[PDB]
Amino acid sequence: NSNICEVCNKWGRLFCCDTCPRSFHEHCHIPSVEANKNPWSCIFCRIKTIQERCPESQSGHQESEVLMRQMLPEEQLKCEFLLLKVYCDSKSCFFASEPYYNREGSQGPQKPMWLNKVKTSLNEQMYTRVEGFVQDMRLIFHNHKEFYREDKFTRLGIQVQDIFEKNFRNIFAIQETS
Ligand SMILES: [Zn+2]
Ligand SMILES: [Zn+2]
Ligand SMILES: [Zn+2]
């Protein structure tokens, strides 16, 4: 197995996947690495299994249909993996914890949002449809773009949103378009 966490790329107290060579810190994995379970399979492995059990799940889908899906176990897992893919980017640090807003010429958003809030929300089964999760994720980046206006720091929002959207289209097999 790898000797660094797949998500944050640091060593430390790592849990090793039994079906692939990836490793994780306990709270870097989503969901948090389970207490017992031997063997243990990581979320990358669990997602690959879904795909292998239903090859047709990779055919293109309309985003509007995906968003209306209820958060049954497989959709819960897919949203956990998509959230994990965003944390895998080091620029996610900017969006992880609760933001605050005091900048001359800007007003803070009406509905602040951040990754760890989404993480808790998923853990607590607060989303009933995929749409709930996707709306909160998109709101993170839209709040950032609106607040930072013409400062070049706005680009961090564009960058991390692009990671989110590419992974969304991949994980949920959204139909490719020009
Ligand atoms: Zn880690
Ligand atoms: Zn694995
Ligand atoms: Zn089948």
CATH fit for domain 60-178, picks 1.20.1300.10, 1.20.920.10, 3.40.50.300, 1.10.645.10: 1.20.920.10
Sign, Cα dihedral of 126, 128, 134, 138: negative
- Cα 19 to averaged position of ligand 2 atoms, centre (Å): 5
Distance 153 CA to ligand 2 centre (A): 35
The rounded Cα 81 to chain-centroid distance in angstroms is 6
Structure token digits, residue 120: 């808790």
What 3-state class would DSSP assign to 41?
coil
Q: Residues 100, 106, 107, 110: what is their CA dihedral angle, to the nearest 10 degrees?
A: -80
C-alpha 55 – ligand 3 centre gap (Å): 6
CA atoms within 13 A on the CB side of 60: 4
Is residue 89 a contact partner of residue 163, using CB atoms and an 8 Å limit?
yes
Task: Report how far ligand 2's centroid is from the alpha carbon of 72 (Å).
Answer: 22
The residue ranges of every structural domain in the chain are: 1-59, 60-178
**105: exposed, middle or buried (Cβ count in 10 Å: 0-12, 13-18, 19+):** exposed
Residue listed under structure tokens 């965003």: 86
Distance CA 126, CA 135 (A): 13
* Fold of the domain built from segment(s) 1-59: Herpes Virus-1 (3.30.40)
C-alpha radius of gyration, the chain, whole number: 17
Closest to 79 measured CA to CA, from 67, 89, 88: 67
Q: Mind spelling out the 3-state secondary structure of 77-132?
A: HHHHHHHHHHHCCHHHHHHHCCCCCCCCCCCCCCCCCCHHHHHHHHHCCCCCEHHH
Q: What is the DSSP letter of 23?
A: E
CA of 52 to the centre of ligand 3 (A): 9
Cα(18) to ligand 2 centroid in Å equals: 6
Whether the CB-CB separation of 9 and 24 falls below 8 Å is answered with no
Phi and psi at residue 15, to the nearest 5°? -105, 135
How far, in Å, is the centroid of ligand 1 from the Cα of 107?
A: 34
Task: Give me ligand 1 centre to Cα 122, in Å.
Answer: 19
Q: How far apart are CA 66 and CA 128, in angstroms?
A: 13
Q: Which ligand is nearest to the CA of 54?
A: 3
- Phi/psi for 146 (5° steps) reads -65, -35
Q: How was this structure determined?
A: X-ray
Residue 53 Cα, ligand 3 centroid: separation in angstroms? 6
